[PDB]
Amino acid sequence: XXXXXXXXXXXXXXXXXXXXXXXXXXXXXXXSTRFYDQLNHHIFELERKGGILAIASLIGVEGGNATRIGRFANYLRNLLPSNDPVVMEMASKAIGRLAMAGDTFTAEYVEFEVKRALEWLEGRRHAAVLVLRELAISVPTFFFQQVQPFFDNIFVAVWDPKQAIREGAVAALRACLILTTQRWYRHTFEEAEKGFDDDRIHGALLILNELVRISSMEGERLREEMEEIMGFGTKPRHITPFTXXXXXXXXXXXXXXXXXXXXXXXXXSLIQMTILNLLPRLAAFRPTQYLQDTMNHVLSCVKKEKERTAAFQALGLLSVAVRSEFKVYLPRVLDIIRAALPPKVDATVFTCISMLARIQQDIKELLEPMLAVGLSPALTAVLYDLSRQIPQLKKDIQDGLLKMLSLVLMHDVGSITLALRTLGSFEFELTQFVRHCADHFLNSEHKEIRMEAARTCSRLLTPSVSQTAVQVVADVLSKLLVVGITDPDPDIRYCVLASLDERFDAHLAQAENLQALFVALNDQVFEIRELAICTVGRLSSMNPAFVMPFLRKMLIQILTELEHSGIGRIKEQSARMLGHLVSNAPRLIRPYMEPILKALILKLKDPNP
Amino acid sequence: CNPKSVLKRPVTSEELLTPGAPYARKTFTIVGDAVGWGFVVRGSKPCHIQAVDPSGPAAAAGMKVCQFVVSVNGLNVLHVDYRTVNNLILTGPRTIVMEVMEELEC
Numbered sequence: 001x002x003x004x005x006x007x008x009x010x011x012x013x014x015x016x017x018x019x020x021x022x023x024x025x026x027x028x029x030x031x032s033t034r035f036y037d038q039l040n041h042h043i044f045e046l047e048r049k050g051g052i053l054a055i056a057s058l059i060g061v062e063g064g065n066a067t068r069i070g071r072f073a074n075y076l077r078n079l080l081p082s083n084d085p086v087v088m089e090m091a092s093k094a095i096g097r098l099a100m101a102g103d104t105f106t107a108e109y110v111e112f113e114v115k116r117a118l119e120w121l122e123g124r125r126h127a128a129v130l131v132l133r134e135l136a137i138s139v140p141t142f143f144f145q146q147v148q149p150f151f152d153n154i155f156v157a158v159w160d161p162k163q164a165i166r167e168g169a170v171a172a173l174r175a176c177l178i179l180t181t182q183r184w185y186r187h188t189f190e191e192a193e194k195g196f197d198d199d200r201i202h203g204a205l206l207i208l209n210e211l212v213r214i215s216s217m218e219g220e221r222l223r224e225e226m227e228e229i230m231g232f233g234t235k236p237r238h239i240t241p242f243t244x245x246x247x248x249x250x251x252x253x254x255x256x257x258x259x260x261x262x263x264x265x266x267x268x269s270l271i272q273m274t275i276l277n278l279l280p281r282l283a284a285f286r287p288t289q290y291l292q293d294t295m296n297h298v299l300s301c302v303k304k305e306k307e308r309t310a311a312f313q314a315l316g317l318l319s320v321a322v323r324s325e326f327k328v329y330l331p332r333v334l335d336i337i338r339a340a341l342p343p344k345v346d347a348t349v350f351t352c353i354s355m356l357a358r359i360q361q362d363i364k365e366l367l368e369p370m371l372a373v374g375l376s377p378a379l380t381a382v383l384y385d386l387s388r389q390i391p392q393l394k395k396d397i398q399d400g401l402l403k404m405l406s407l408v409l410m411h412d413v414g415s416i417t418l419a420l421r422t423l424g425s426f427e428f429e430l431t432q433f434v435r436h437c438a439d440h441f442l443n444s445e446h447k448e449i450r451m452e453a454a455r456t457c458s459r460l461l462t463p464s465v466s467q468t469a470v471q472v473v474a475d476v477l478s479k480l481l482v483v484g485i486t487d488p489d490p491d492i493r494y495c496v497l498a499s500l501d502e503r504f505d506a507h508l509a510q511a512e513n514l515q516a517l518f519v520a521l522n523d524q525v526f527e528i529r530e531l532a533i534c535t536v537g538r539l540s541s542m543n544p545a546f547v548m549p550f551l552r553k554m555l556i557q558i559l560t561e562l563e564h565s566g567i568g569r570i571k572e573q574s575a576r577m578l579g580h581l582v583s584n585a586p587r588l589i590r591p592y593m594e595p596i597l598k599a600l601i602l603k604l605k606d607p608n609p
Numbered sequence: 610c611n612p613k614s615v616l617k618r619p620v621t622s623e624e625l626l627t628p629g630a631p632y633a634r635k636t637f638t639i640v641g642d643a644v645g646w647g648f649v650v651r652g653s654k655p656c657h658i659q660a661v662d663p664s665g666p667a668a669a670a671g672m673k674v675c676q677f678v679v680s681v682n683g684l685n686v687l688h689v690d691y692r693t694v695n696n697l698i699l700t701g702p703r704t705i706v707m708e709v710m711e712e713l714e715c
Contacts (some may be wrong), residue, residue, distance in 0.1 A: 230703055232641065391683075 002035045006042070013043050013050035021053035028061035036062075037071060044075055048087045052079075056094040064101035072098075073109060080127050088127055096134035110135055110142045118146060121153040122162065129168040136175035144179060151176075151184060155191035161199045163270060170206045181214050185245045196256060198267040202274035205260050208253035209278045212285050215246035219284040222358075223317055226351050229381050239583050254282045254290055261293035269306060276301055276310045280317030287322045294318065295329065302336050309348060316352035341369050347378040354382040357390055364393065371404050375419060384426035398429050409433055413446060420452040423460075430460050431472065438479050450492050454480070458499035464507070477507050481516045490525050497531050508535065509542045518550060526573050530580055537584025544587075551588050555581065563599055568608035575603075614651075618712075621655045621677055625710055626687075632677075632712045639667050641703030650678060650691050658709075677710035 005027070012020035036058065044051040055072055062068070076098070079091040099110050114135065117128035132150075136143045158169045177188070188207065196204035213220055261279060264271050279294040298318070302311040315333060319326055326333075333356075337349055350370065357363065373379065383401060387394045405428075408419050434457055441453040457480065461473055484496040500508060507513065517536060523529045533554070540547040558581065561574040578596070582589050589596070625632065639646055647662030658676045661668050678694070679687035682701050686694050698705055 232703060233700060 001032070002039075006039060009039055009043055009050075009054070012053065013047050017050065018053075021050070021057055024054065025057035025061055028058050031062070033067075040072070041075075048079070048084065049090060051075075052087065052090045052094050056090075056097050059094075059101065060097055064098065064103045064105075066103075066105065069098075069103060069105045069109070073105075080131075081124065083123055083127075085123075088123055089130060092127060092130035092134060095131055096138050099135060100138045106139075107142065110139055111145065114142065114146055118149045118153055121157045122164065125157065125162075126164045126168055129165065129172055133168060133172040133175050136172060136179060140179050143176070144183070147176075147180075147184065151187055151191075155188075155195070158203055159195045159200055166203055170203065173207070174210065177210050177214060181246070185211075189245070189249065193256065196260070198264060198271060201260060201264045201267070202271040205257055205274055205278045208257050209281060211246040211253045212250045212282050215250055216285050219281040219317065219321075222320055222355070223281070223313065226313065226316065226355060229351055229378055237583075239586065241583055242579075251286050254286065257282050258290050258293045261290075262296050265297060265300070272297075272301060272307060273310070276307055276314050280314040280321065284317055284321035288325055291318070291322055291325070299332060308340075309345060312348040312352045316348075316355035319352065319356045320358055338369065341373050344373045346373055347376055350376065350378045350382045354385055354389075357386070359390060361392075364396065367397075367400060371400065375408065375415060375422060377418065377421070380422050380425060402429065409437075413449070417448050417452050420449075420456050424452075424456050434460050434476065435472065438476055441483070442479070447489055447491070450483075450487070450489070451495050454483070454492060454495050454499060458496075458501075458504075462503060464503055473507060474510070474513075477504065477513065478516075481513060481520075485516060485520050485523075490528065493523075493525065493528055497528050500535060505535075505539060505542070509539050511543075511546065514539070514543065514546055521554065526577075530577060533577060534580050534584045537581055540585045540588060547585075548588055551581065551585055555588070555592065559596065559599055562603070571603075572608065615659065615674065616652065616657050617675075618657075621657075621710075622688075625655065625677060625679065631715050632710045635671070635709050635711045637667075637670055637672055637707045637709050639670060639672070639705045639707060641705070642666050646698075646705065648672065650694055652677065652691055654688060655679075655710075656686060656689065656691050656694050671711075672707075672709065673711075675712060677712075678707055679710070680706075680708045682706045 008020055008023070011017075012024070040051070040054050040058065043054045055075060059068060059072065076091065076095060079087075083091060095113065099106055113128075113131045117132050120128045132143070154169055154173065158165060158173070173188075188210075192204050192207040257278065261275065264275060266272070275297055279298060283290050283294055298311060298314050301307040302315070319333075337353070340346055340349055350373075353363070353366070353370065367383075370379065383397060387397045405423065409423065437453055437457060441450045441457075444450055444453070457476060461476065464473060480496055480499075484493055484500075487493055487496075508517065514536075517532060520532045521529060521536070523532065533551075536547055536551065540551065558574050558578045561570055562578070565571055565574070639648075642665070644665070646667055647665030648667050649659040649661075650656050651659035655677045656679075658672070658674060658678065661672050661674055679685060681694060681697055682705055684697065686697065
């Protein structure tokens with residue numbers, strides 16, 4: 001593990017590289033110490049991306065130690081003064097992961113970086129900013145240790161004519177003001193308004209938003225969820241298995257934003273980017289003159305390009321905020337949506353149609369161009385949440401939506417995968433399709449299609465009296481059992497086995513199906529074997545005449561592998577397996593408890609954890 | 610004297626049903642918690658909210674004491690007993706969709 005692992009370490013420094021580092025982290029799970037320090041130093045000095053992948057991954061898994069911290073601290077202190085882009089952000093993330101290790105040296109290491117970060121406040125300035133931002137998230141306590149130097153130095157450095165600093169330093173000021181609000185504000189507004197009085201425009205708006213956005217999360221919670229786009233009554237198992245100035249200056253923040261809603265109409269893409277995000281959240285606190293200054297900049301950016309993506313998102317927040325007064329601007333907004341969709345970016349258009357109602361019967365006619373755009377994860381998430389919020393015609397939604405599904409599932413690869421996610425994501429109202437899908441997965445060499453089509457058929461058999469329907473379910477489940485036994489790819493076997501829920505226990509308990517399951521108890525994968533004995537044990541009440549004789553042979557084998565095999569793993573696996581037997585088949589095991597307990601006591605008096 | 614009643618409004622039956630005027634409807638979605646939602650509804654006909662835990666998730670998402678409910682998790686419960694609604698909320702999912710009458714200080 002010195003030179004042989006050095007061959008893959010050199011192939012990691014030279015897709016596969018990220019997996020080579022992921023395999024190194026996985027190698028740190030099983031795991032000499034001196035050779036790993038030399039191997040990390042070999043990759044460091046040479047390339048820098050693989051060196052950070054070697055340092056950070058090992059430290060997280062192998063565990064921070066006084067030896068490891070004292071050595072690797074010098075390596076991290078060398079990267080920061082001078083480094084390339086991309087590598088710099090990776091080295092700053094390796095600081096955050098080291099600072100969240102929870103060691104005694106963390107107090108010294110964090111405050112060492114923070115003190116030097118204040119000295120700087122360009123690979124020096126932006127590095128210190130990423131250090132302070134990640135430490136503010138990971139370590140709130142020591143980030144608060146230097147607050148007065150924090151604000152004073154940063155309000156000077158932010159307003160320098162730079163773009164990388166403005167992107168990161170506001171996220172550090174964001175991370176600071178969140179910690180300040182939960183626990184300065186006068187010194188923030190003073191230096192911000194001094195800076196506002198064209199590089200010194202788009203920065204003030206983010207500071208003004210700080211008072212509006214933190215005081216009212218209601219604006220952010222709508223935007224944060226759209227960007228991403230059990231039960232209390234369950235009976236537990238009888239055998240437990242082992243386990244102020246932000247609101248008073250809110251409109252004032254908008255008053256200094258209203259003037260910054262038409263002044264910087266077209267300056268210098270970068271400034272326009274900060275304007276179009278902030279305006280809806282500022283208006284969402286207090287909506288028309290503020291909107292008119294917003295609408296002039298926002299509406300003009302929708303027709304333009306490089307901003308249309310954020311333009312509808314701002315308008316979607318604006319549509320929820322401005323409820324009644326928006327009806328005047330219906331012809332303006334709807335004409336761009338009716339023109340934008342035919343070209344197919346438009347993933348936002350559907351999200352905002354959900355946020356626009358968040359209504360009229362016109363939307364019913366608006367669906368027929370909407371659906372003609374194409375299969376996207378936003379559209380089907382919207383139409384599901386459309387029938388949630390406004391279930392006026394939930395049947396008409398399902399009527400039209402099933403017509404789309406029929407066209408899709410009648411007739412590349414990643415779309416059919418997502419099309420199965422489409423069929424399987426939200427509720428629906430499917431016999432021929434599934435009997436035809438039983439051919440597709442068998443006759444598909446794509447691993448991901450088989451893995452998803454399995455999830456689909458088991459879900460569409462949730463309605464589980466006509467004999468033909470039962471025989472169909474029996475046929476489909478027989479094909480699934482064949483795939484679950486014979487498929488080479490254990491991932492497909494893993495999904496199928498996991499898909500055999502409580503719902504199917506009436507069908508799995510059939511004689512023919514149970515004879516298949518018995519073969520499955522000799523599976524290559526122990527975990528599937530574990531899950532199978534759980535299923536078989538659970539069925540031992542339904543059909544004890546078959547299950548109890550078969551578990552008896554298995555019980556002997558478990559105790560044979562336990563007692564007679566002189567190997568840690570096999571004995572360890574056998575105990576775990578006997579665990580699942582006790583829990584799932586308690587009737588069988590009670591008469592035989594004294595033999596088992598003597599064997600287990602003997603294992604307890606044996607001289608691997 | 611064993612029961613406690615904290616609702617000033619004697620009856621709101623048919624007072625709510627009329628559109629507009631005294632209140633403005635709002636829909637509150639409450640997510641389940643390990644310690645429970647922390648609200649009680651004790652209105653016979655209108656099923657008004659009896660009390661709300663100030664530190665609970667419901668109080669964070671509005672849910673003031675002086676409110677009336679008519680629908681829970683979609684199903685309309687405008688005219689049922691409070692205990693019957695209590696059965697529905699417990700038998701339902703962890704996250705509860707609730708509509709609050711939310712009288713506007715009248």
